[model samples]
Target: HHHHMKHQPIEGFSKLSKQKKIDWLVSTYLEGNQQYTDILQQYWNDNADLQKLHEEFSENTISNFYMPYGIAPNFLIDGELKAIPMAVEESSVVAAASKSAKFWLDKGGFRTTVINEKKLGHTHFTFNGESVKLQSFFNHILKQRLFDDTEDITKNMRSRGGGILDIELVDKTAQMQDYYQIKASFNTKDSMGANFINSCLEQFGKTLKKEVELSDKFTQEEKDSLRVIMNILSNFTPDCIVRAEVSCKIEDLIDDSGIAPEEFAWKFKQAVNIAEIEPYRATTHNKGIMNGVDAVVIATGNDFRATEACAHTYASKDGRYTSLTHCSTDNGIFRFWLDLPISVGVVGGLTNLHPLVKFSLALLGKPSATELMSIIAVSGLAQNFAALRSLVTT
Candidate 1:
């Protein structure tokens, strides 16, 4: 045990030069090992211009974290045969989607439909006033005023065929006294619109407080009782959803995975059935699905954290945690599908920034946000197909 070089923790490390920060980092946490420092430095980009841009993605910059960018070939989506881009380091996941895609390619292939593209936000407030009076004020004076006030902020979005679609004043005082929300519905077309929705929600807060303070609809005490608690967008968007499905006659299931066609379909169905009802299986089941989804999400430079949160929370709905997938053997056709709500945009901040993200978008045929959602759902289903095949046979 050689406690040789002495360098304790120091503040202002963030302001230190990128190379120097790692110098101290390795010395402090890695026993002054040069090899440890080399590990991080080795992942840096070759060109200086590109390297700096990569480092600028986050603070406390080090070398870039690399992952494999794999293409799962032979995916037939909506009668269009194309390959899918997936960026993930884990082994076998890309292969999983790849195998599943090839298997379905012989069948009728994957079909997808964007159920809806609506998102939501909330402007929460505490107004310890009579519900009857508040309701009357909202119905006559507040409702249209809220929309009018957000016009300037939504002008560009509305011009682009999207913006605030509808809104409602919700009273939740029974659950949390004096708590309420201006629950707003938004249609952002081809963008994720988290910022768009959130900015509008914040404006709602301002407009609400201003109108409540100025209106003759409330007494001085009632006006004083109102308080804006918080304003933000909700990531749990069930309405902003897409569905992907694969189907074929059960007899046409001859593939590399050696199992009786009918038995294979039944085993897959039973596995999905167990995942649909059992939380233990459901959690792992969805994890494999995300293995494919998250890869595409990263490849496209989208927010997997928000996407993952939405998917997991979706499973918790309908009373208990269950699978996001479904199965049907109607008329001897083996059909499998899943509905996923992933907030992704083709024209967001990061789409153009990351070098490979644009490459991925181009590889996917420059898909629209809704089209990207379809691809994402299919990726998840493809992965689930592969996993169930392996689990059923292995």
Candidate 2:
């Protein structure tokens, strides 16, 4: 009889040597088949040094996972023409982005701006006490104490002018009594800084609990009820935003695509407005936008999951799920734009490790974090316009 639970955890699994782990995996799962062993080795780089570098990225010493790394050229962003690297499996995305880039290349092209670039994290706690008392303690005592407690951790970041900015106590007890949050925001400069943010938040949680334990203001019950929950970074960063837009005379939209310029503009605007109002349509519409954003995000070795989560959260920021791209017409000029909350990095993580990522960044003209934000947002805008044009033209 076969065991119901086939795989079981082994003692000191992580402490085993790389080869030992592979040996155990093949013997248990692959029935000691050398074919499976060869399959794992097939994708390894021919160069020993490069293979070693890839192994350093993660554990278990597995082979590399490959994706098609292509470029969508002819992007005239902010008066400069450049090619953008895209890593995606889908066949049509690169062509569509490239088509949009080519269509706008002769026109004014894309204009992009970094609206804001502050990332956020939080420490959630429960205080089943007077909201006013917690607020007073946070403002007068806890705020300064949070900074003082984190001085050692923030020492290097502060010198570089990229450390904890502020912390605030948010009262959410009306919705759920005893629910409160300590919201902290940070500037991480070029890196994503997930580790840094979490470390600081954990420290903040400890400090809050210790202060509560030492305080004389609360009764025994209040002291026992005031407790820390979790400390982690937030993917929904509303302030880390970038905007990209393309505009031209409404008549200038005319092309050999067989649709009248005025009809096309009206249809496009109406399609976007529908997406803005309907959640079902809005999900797919935003997925189209992410096709461009995520490709660039992966190519540059950034966290695409975090980008997607933050973007989807922002889409529903007004309590109604809607489109990320918007359209409007004024003075005979047709305009389409995207205002997205995106936090990406040009340094750290796989940005410096992956060979293709390095090449992608170099091909992108070595943009800083802010500059990369512009490029990524513009990619999404171009993609949305292309998709909308196709929808109306058909």
What are the per-model C-alpha RMSD values against the true structure?
A: 1.7, 2.5
In terms of lDDT, the best-performing candidate is 1
- Give lDDT per model, in order: 0.90, 0.88
TM-score of 2: 0.92
Candidate 1 lDDT score relative to the true structure: 0.90
Candidate with maximal TM-score:
1
Per-residue lDDT over 111-185 for candidate 1, one digit per residue giving the tens place of the 0 to 100 score: 999999889899999997888888889988899999999999999999999999998999898899988899999
What tens-digit string does per-residue lDDT give for candidate 2 at 276-363?
A: 9999999999999999999999999998999999999999999999999999987788999999899988887755788889998899
lDDT of 1 at 344: 85
Clashes of 2: 0
Please give the clash total of every predicted structure, in order.
Answer: 0, 0
Sum up the clashes in candidate 1: 0
